[PDB]
Each structure stands twice: as structure tokens, then as C-alpha cells.
Amino acid sequence: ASEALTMIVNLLRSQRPLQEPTVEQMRAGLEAMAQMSPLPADVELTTVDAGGVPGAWVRVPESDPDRVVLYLHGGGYVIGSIRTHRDLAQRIARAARCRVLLIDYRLAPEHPHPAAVEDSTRAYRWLLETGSDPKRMAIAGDSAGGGLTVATLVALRDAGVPLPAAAVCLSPWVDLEGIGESMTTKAAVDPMVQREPLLRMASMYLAGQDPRTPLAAPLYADLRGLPPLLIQVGTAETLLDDSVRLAERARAAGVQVTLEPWEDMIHVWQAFAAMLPEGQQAIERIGEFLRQHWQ
Numbered sequence: 001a002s003e004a005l006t007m008i009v010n011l012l013r014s015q016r017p018l019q020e021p022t023v024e025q026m027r028a029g030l031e032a033m034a035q036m037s038p039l040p041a042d043v044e045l046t047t048v049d050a051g052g053v054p055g056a057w058v059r060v061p062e063s064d065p066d067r068v069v070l071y072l073h074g075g076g077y078v079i080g081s082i083r084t085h086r087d088l089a090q091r092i093a094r095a096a097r098c099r100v101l102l103i104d105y106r107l108a109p110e111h112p113h114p115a116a117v118e119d120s121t122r123a124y125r126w127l128l129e130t131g132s133d134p135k136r137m138a139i140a141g142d143s144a145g146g147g148l149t150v151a152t153l154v155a156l157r158d159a160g161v162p163l164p165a166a167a168v169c170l171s172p173w174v175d176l177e178g179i180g181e182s183m184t185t186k187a188a189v190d191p192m193v194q195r196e197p198l199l200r201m202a203s204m205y206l207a208g209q210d211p212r213t214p215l216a217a218p219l220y221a222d223l224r225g226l227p228p229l230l231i232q233v234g235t236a237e238t239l240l241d242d243s244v245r246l247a248e249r250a251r252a253a254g255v256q257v258t259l260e261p262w263e264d265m266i267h268v269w270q271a272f273a274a275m276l277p278e279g280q281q282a283i284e285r286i287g288e289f290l291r292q293h294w295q
């Protein structure tokens, strides 16, 4: 891997964003980190009421105005915001030459499951209501948002809603029990995700519901009929086997799934694209994948 990976690993081993002692300190810690990445002057952000879910349109100069990614941020269903993920949103908008709708879906523990999925599906249905075409759309998300991407597609399909052209999962979180082999075998190389913070956030999201509830933990969902799916994941990830098991389940359900394991990469390494060459390379690949499925 690039020497820059050492810099990112050193930052994460000190900031320990998922190990802050309170939910408000976890939220503030991630906001402080995101404030570091310099936002380009050519990014246009427009606040919108996305059918009762707060959102922001993210547009860059070469955004095709009729192509839309609904972007679902990570943060364990507990942290993250429009502010934390607007940089990753604008990088995807640039690579995919599209607009991004970045939504502020309801967070736990204040709003447990299924609030996040009610909000993601509402925002998608609002895009259709306001004239977006499914063949020009995609859903994408990182970590918890990657799991929410799969759950959103399942819920839309089950409601007879037309599905988008493609979807993208970045280090998705789909096993709320942390029972993948890599949760043990990659614990020594993952500077961000470990089983204890995973179970802490799962508890807040589930609020005592079965941890295999399919729309919370889409490892257990019916994935038949989903559109083409890109899963990007790092091999230095306790969540590696979330992606491997998701790929297995989606392929068994007849889905056109691309599993891309990036050697030595850490959790949502794409977020560090300002400094990490592999982050920008991975975002360029997301853009290629989306443009291919919109052709």
C-alpha cells in the first residue's frame, strides 16, 4: 500500500472516533475530523426537504442534472451527518458526473430501527415523485450506510417501487452481531472498527429487536431482484467478512455483484482521498461503475 496509508492509520489510532465515551462526543469527534478535508470552491450545496427527510443536493461543474445518487452516510446508525459526508458526496458526484442527494436520515439511539430505512425509502420515493428516472439513479453508502443501501433496495422492491440502475456499498455493515471470522482475525490491523463499538452502536439502533431483523441486518434479507451492486472493502478490516458474506448472499439471489477487496485498505479509506491515493483511485472506480450502468 501507499506510504500515505501509514499517515491515515496513525491519525485513526489517535482519534479513535468510535471509542469516544458518549454519543455526543462520538458525533462531535467525527464532525471535527471531517472539518479537516478542504471542500472545493466549485461544490454547490443546496438544502432541501426531501419529502419530509432533510437533505442536501451536492453538485459539481460536470454533474449531469438528470443523474442522481441517493447517498446514505455511515456512522453505525448513530453518528455522521450531511457535514461529515459532504466531501465524499462531492468526490462521488465528480467521478460519476452526477448530482448527489445526501440525506440526514434519523439516527439512533434517539430514533431506532426502522427510522433510518423509513427515511431512505421516503427520500427515494420523493426523488421519483419530483421526476427522477430510476434508470438514471443509484443508491450508495458507506459502513452503516452501505447496509442501509441494501435494506433500502429490499424495502423499495417489497413495496413495488421501481429500483435504480445500480447500487454501491463501501465497507458495508450488514452483521449487527459481529460474528464474521475477520471480526477476530483482522482485529489487530483495523485502526477504526472493533467488535465492542460495533455492538454498542447495534444496541442503540436495534433497541432490543432481533439482531438478525432483515432490514437492520441485510445479511438475513431476501436480496432477489436487486440491481447491479459494487461492494468495495479493505482487507485490513474487521468488516471484511460483512462484504464477503453480502457478496455470497447477493450472488446466491441472482444479483449482478462486483466484490472489490482493496489489499491493506482500512475502513471507508475513500473518505481519506484528499491524502490517500487508493481513496481517490477507489472513488474513480465508483464513478466508472455508475457511468457504465447509466449507459
Ligand SMILES: O=[N+]([O-])c1ccc(O)cc1
Pocket: 018, 074, 075, 076, 077, 142, 143, 144, 145, 173, 193, 194, 197, 198, 199, 201
Ligand atoms: O462506520 N460505521 O458505520 C460503523 C461503526 C461501527 C461498526 O461496528 C460498524 C460500522
